[PDB]
Each structure stands twice: as C-alpha cells, then as structure tokens.
C-alpha cells in the first residue's frame, strides 16, 4: 500500500540544523557519499533562532585560555559533564569559531577587526578566580541565524545529497548495529529506506513536551524517540534547562546577551534581586541558579505584571546605540510580542523551557554508546551530535553559548571519526527485505486513527502535565503524579483521532508521529526525575536539597568512606522505554572525570558550586 524507495549511501545524517549541516558536508568533504535527511528546509531549523553567540577562547577582548572555558563548563555542568568531551569541545572551540568566520559568518567586529565577544552567564578568567570572561562570539543577537545561513551556504559547495521535508521514522537496526533510517517523503507521501554504513542523528531537542518553551513547534525529540524505539538508552533526560528570560506570553527567547551587555533583572519592588541570590555573578550566574532565583521571587509575592507572575529585564539604562548595535533582534521582538520599547520600559520575562541537557548518550567522538555490565560499548554505525546528543558536555546545566559550539565541534567530530574509522565506498550492509515494516504499520495506523482523543488534545494534556509536574522545582509526590498522569496519557494514545486521510503533506499525521516521539521523551524525563533523589544543576528536588556525590566534597576527603555507586547520584541516568506498554526502566553509568590529557588540562574534582 506504500511504495518503498531504497537508497544506498556511505553515511546518512538525520537533521539539518547546525550540527547536522556540519556533520553532513564534513562527511562529503572527506569523500563520503552522504545523504542529509531533514524534516524542514535547513535554514528553518531551531538553530536559526539562536541569539547570544558561541563561546571560544579567542582572546579578542582580553587574554584568554581555553582551559578556563573548560573549567567553567565543568563547574557549569555540576560535575555530571564528561570532562573528556568538555576538553575536546573547549580546546576545539577557537579553531571551530575561526572556521565559521572563514566560511563567511558575519561576526560583529572589534576596533582591531577581530570577532567581537561579550560577557555571558557563568564564564570566568583564571579558573574561576579572574573576573568575568568575555568569550561569547556573536553576530549582534542573531548568531544562530548567521551560523545556520553560513553553514547552509557552505554546504552548497559539496556533493551532499539532500532529502528535504522527509520525516525519519526509525533506525534500521540489526544485531546491535545501525544500518540506516526509514523515512516518509512529505512532499509525495512515499516511504524511503536509507541504507548506509554510518548514521548520524542530529535532530535537535524536545522542548515541546512542555506547555511553555522557547523551542520551535518542530522541536519534537524525533531522533531521541527513534533511539528509544531501537531499544537503546537515552541519557540524563530529566535535566531540562529553563532559560531565565523567555518573554511573558508567547515564550519567545530574550537572549542572555541582554544581561551580558549590562541589562538587569528586577522584581516588583525594583530590587536587582540577583545581587542577593548570587552576589558575585549577579544576573550572570548560571541559568539553573538564575531561573530558580526568579521562580522564588514570583512564588514569594514579588512577581510583576497584573498577575504577579513574571519579573522584569531592564535594558533602558543602557545607551540606545548599544541596544541598536548589540541587541537589535530582541528590540524588535520585545515590540512585536510585548509592545515594549526596550529604551523606555523593561521586558516581561520568566524562566521558560529552553534546552535539553540529556539526549542520545555518546562518547567524545560522537559515537552512540550503550552500557552493559558496567562497561560502555559503542553502537556500531551510529553517531549523534548537537542538542539531541549527550556527550555529555553540559551535564546537569548548560552554559549559554556552549550549544552552538557543541553543534559545530561535535558535528565535525562525527565526520572526523567516520573518516578515521571507515573508508568511502565500503559495501553498505544489507538489511532484511522487510526491514522498517513496523514503522509503516504505525504510520498507517495513525493516518486512519478514528478514536476519541484527537492529537491536539493529547499533546495539550502532555504539555500541561509536564509544565506543572516537572518544572523548575520538583518534589516526589508531584513527580509521581506526573508519572501516573503521563503513563495514562501514553495508554490513551490507543484512542487517538486524526482527520486527514491523505498522505501528501499530511501534517495531521506528521504531528501525530511527533506526539508519539514527544511522549517517549517526556516519559523518560519525568520518570528519571522522580528516581533522582538529589539536587544537581537544573534538577532541583525540594525533598532532596543536597547534591549527593561519591564523597562529601564540602569537607576534606582524608578518611572518608567512599560511597558505593548505588548510594550516590554522581552518575548519568540511562532510560529505556518498552514502547508497547510505555514502561520506563532506568539504569546508571559513571561520569567520566579524566580529560584527554592530564598534563595539558587537569581533571577538575567536584566542589561546592556557587556563583
């Protein structure tokens, strides 16, 4: 009933945001015949909406050292980050940003002609002792737009075969190896199997499990879900980042560059409240700490607006020419979506779901891993990079301007590793003749679904459930109810209702597939949250307020009984879902503390984390 079209490549990249673009043409540039399969035209990816910039220790504003950026990221992650991946990312950052400027990215400039860099949340000089760092390279406040448009333009010079507006449904697995992906061509309603020696998942995040997020409508966890349907684990999915400043109402992002350029957060009584919560960093503390701070001010009666449910971002004390040159994007957006003139009045802002720290777990080379009997094992043929991956460079909390860096650093890493591991033209592995057949059965089931609960209503019940049960502060009783409500909504998917029986541009159908995918991510997120009985980074448990490591790092380690791996929480969550029942199983694997080169860059032991 569905004509299946079969393709053969050396490599298939799923996703055409910043990470997938970089991986895809990087692969073609190494001589690999590469398909890039994307559900959106590439410049529409959520990466296009990024604003504040991309970190790299170029030293254009002061003397810098990538090792300070390494340290900031490790402390930023609250010691759930893998220090080998953070070493790779931060050491690679100067060459990666320079690669982008040489492609033609129109970076803002300094008086010396070099790339302008601003201050940004949680970055410091001298290993946390030297004052605020200025290493966030930016194109005004549209860095992601230019990043993506430059990567897309650069990709046109290469033989990469693009499959635009194709929706990947599942991976083709055989004996624990990925053999490619299966997808639906939205433009004409046909099914396509992409066989390839290597498959790269770069599908973005899943902010749309929540009711208010900064993310595009298209951030639906699609690659994450395919990994879950493959019986593979995802990692750290309970770790969701609330950006301090989504605009009240539509949820649109207002960049942390506003605070990096001088803007300040104020409450109803005009207090710059961050001076009380984080006396050193102030409005440039880490995002988990700023978002928790704002959330405390609102629930303690200092919310702004007629409902006492947001706070203010003040920019008007800053010179108007600085706003025009450094923050033109949010100046328009504050007018359109708030009717605010940033030179006269503050922007109403509140913490809003923004970024997923967890994802498909990988090693520092981008290779997807599983974990079996205490040992990490690479999944042959399968790579992930970008917000859909958990390398993990971000741990429990991502520093602003580190995601765009992750995209280009690990997108290229995936390409470099395939090139050092495989050769072009190697015989693409065969699949059984019926491979992917179950993906089509599910599609046909949803396309003709005629139950009691239309897709928009089931999605809404998921988003409001996540919003009120898996928010900035969490507790066990409330998480447990969110787990119970979510599992019921998962079962009630058997009652789904769709109306569009076509197959060409059936977004009624495509959004029902995305719903299934969001549901798998959300089940893993909230069940992992309920199990994690500690507070770390963005995961704050008011019934378990302390961070629980293998030692108490607040006192000297001399004479301490190390805690067994099962009795502490400095470990990655590994989540699996039985897709038929919706039952979530959880395991744990150790954080990697070794760097790539101890003499070049010391492992940073865990410590009290305060801004």
């Amino acid at each position: 009933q569905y004509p299946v079209v079969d393709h053969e490549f050396d490599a298939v990249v799923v996703g055409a945001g910043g990470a997938g673009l970089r991986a895809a043409f990087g692969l073609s540039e190494a001589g690999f015949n590469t398909a890039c399969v994307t559900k959106l035209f590439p410049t529409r990816s959520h990466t296009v909406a990024a604003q504040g910039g991309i970190n790299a220790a170029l030293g254009n504003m002061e003397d810098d050292n990538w090792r300070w950026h390494f340290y900031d990221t490790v402390k930023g992650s609250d010691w759930l980050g893998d220090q080998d991946a953070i070493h790779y990312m931060t050491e690679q950052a100067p060459a990666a940003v320079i690669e982008l400027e040489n492609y033609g990215m129109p970076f803002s400039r300094t008086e010396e002609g070099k790339i302008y860099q601003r201050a940004f949340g949680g970055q410091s000089l001298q290993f946390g002792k030297g004052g605020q760092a200025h290493r966030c390279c930016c194109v005004a406040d549209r860095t992601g737009h230019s990043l993506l448009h430059t990567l897309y333009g650069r990709s046109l010079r290469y033989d990469t075969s693009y499959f635009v507006e194709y929706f990947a449904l599942d991976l083709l697995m055989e004996n624990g190896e990925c053999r490619g992906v299966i997808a639906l061509c939205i433009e004409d309603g046909t099914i396509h199997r992409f066989r390839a020696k290597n498959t790269v998942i770069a599908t973005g995040g899943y902010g749309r499990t929540y009711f208010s997020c900064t993310s595009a409508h298209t951030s639906t966890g699609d690659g994450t879900a395919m990994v879950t349907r493959a019986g593979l684990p995802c990692q750290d999915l309970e770790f969701v980042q609330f950006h301090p400043t989504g605009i009240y109402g539509a949820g649109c992002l207002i960049t942390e560059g506003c605070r990096g350029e001088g803007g300040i957060l104020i409450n109803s009584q005009g207090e710059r409240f961050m001076e009380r919560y984080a006396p050193v960093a102030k409005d440039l503390a880490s995002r988990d700490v700023v978002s928790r701070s704002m959330t405390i001010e609102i629930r303690e009666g200092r919310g702004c607006g007629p409902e006492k449910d947001h706070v203010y971002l003040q920019l008007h004390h800053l010179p108007p020419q600085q706003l025009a040159t450094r923050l033109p994007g949010i100046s328009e957006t504050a007018m359109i979506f708030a009717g605010v003139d940033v030179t006269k009045e503050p922007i109403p802002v509140l913490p809003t779901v923004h970024y997923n720290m967890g994802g498909i777990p990988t090693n520092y080379k981008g290779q997807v891993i599983t974990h079996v009997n205490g040992e990490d094992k690479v999944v042959p043929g399968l790579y992930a990079c970008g917000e859909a991956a958990s390398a993990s460079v971000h741990g429990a909390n991502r520093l602003g301007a580190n995601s765009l860096l992750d995209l280009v650093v690990f997108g290229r890493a995936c390409a470099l590793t395939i090139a050092e591991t495989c050769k072009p033209g190697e015989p693409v592995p065969s699949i059984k003749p019926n491979a992917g057949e179950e993906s089509v059965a599910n599609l046909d089931k949803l396309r003709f679904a005629d139950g009691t609960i239309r897709t928009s209503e089931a999605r809404l019940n998921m988003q409001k459930t996540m919003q009120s049960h898996a928010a900035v502060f969490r507790t066990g009783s409330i998480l447990q109810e969110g787990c119970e409500k979510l599992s019921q909504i998962y079962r009630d998917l058997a009652h789904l209702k769709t109306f569009d029986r076509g197959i060409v541009w059936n977004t009624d159908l495509v959004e029902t597939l995305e719903l299934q995918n969001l549901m798998l991510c959300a089940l893993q997120t909230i069940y992992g949250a309920e199990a994690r009985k500690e507070s770390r980074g963005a995961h704050a448990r008011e019934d378990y307020k302390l961070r629980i490591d293998e030692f108490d790092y607040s006192k000297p380690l001399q004479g301490q009984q190390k805690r067994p791996f099962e009795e502490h929480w400095r470990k990655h969550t590994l989540s699996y879902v039985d897709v038929k029942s919706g039952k979530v199983t959880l395991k744990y694997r150790p954080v990697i503390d070794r760097t790539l080169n101890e003499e070049d860059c010391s492992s940073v032991p865990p410590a009290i984390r305060s801004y």
Binding site: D159, T160, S161, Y162
Partner: protein, 139 residues
C-alpha cells in the same frame, strides 16, 4: 548532488506536468499607490509610443499635410472647454510619464528608496503632473 540548473529544470518538469494549481496573484494582491503608479508609467509609455507611431504613419499616408488638418479642426469652432479637455488629455500622459521618468532616473542613482520616500516622491509626481497639465492645457 544536484546543480542549481538541474534543480530549476526538475522544478519546471515536475510542476508543469503536475495537477498542482497556480496560486492567485494579481487578482488577490493588495494595491498601493507606488504599485499603481508603476504600471501607469508603463501604460503611459506605451500609449505615447503608439501615438508617435500613428502620427508617423499619418505623415506617410494621409493625402493632406498638417496645416490643412489644423485648419479643418479650427473651422469646426469647437467650444473652449472641449479644446481644453483635448489638450489636457493629450498632455496628461506625457506630463505623467515625464515627471515619473525623472523619479525613475533618481532611483537609478540610488536615491529615494526608503519606503516613505517612495510615497512622498509619488505624491509629488502626482501634483506636478496635475499642475503642469492644467497650466499647459490653458496655453
């Protein structure tokens, strides 16, 4: 793995043989004054040319010469208001095309592209077209 030229060719090949409709355009698009004035510049330009070509054909083909036809016309003793209409109608497209031609020559230097100045310069073209036409039709 497709050049741009191949991409454009496949687009036309795919679409022209498809059942896909062409979305509406001129029948549904909102007019503005600059847009109306742009097409009137073309229409008055074509009209002036077709008037020049007809005049040129009549010089080659009509058995009498111009002063005879002017005499014939005056012998009809037409009303001054009707003479004024005919002169205004003859001079109006020339006046329009001329003043708007000047506006075009200004654009070709790169000046006047702010959308508010496109509007100012068009309204300016309209009042000069009226003033010069009525002054010349009075002559």
């Amino acid at each position: 793995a497709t050049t741009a030229k191949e991409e454009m060719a496949r687009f036309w090949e795919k679409n022209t043989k498809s059942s896909r409709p062409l979305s509406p355009h001129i029948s549904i698009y909102k007019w503005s004054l600059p847009m109306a004035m742009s097409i009137t510049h073309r229409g008055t330009g074509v009209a002036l040319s077709l008037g020049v070509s007809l005049f040129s054909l009549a010089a080659l083909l009509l058995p009498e010469q111009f002063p005879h036809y002017v005499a014939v016309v005056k012998s009809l003793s037409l009303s001054p208001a009707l003479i004024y209409s005919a002169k205004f109608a003859l001079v109006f497209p020339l006046s329009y095309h001329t003043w708007n031609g000047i506006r075009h020559l200004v654009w070709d230097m790169g000046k006047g592209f702010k959308l508010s100045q496109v509007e100012q310069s068009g309204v300016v073209v309209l009042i000069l077209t009226l003033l010069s036409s009525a002054a010349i039709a009075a002559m």
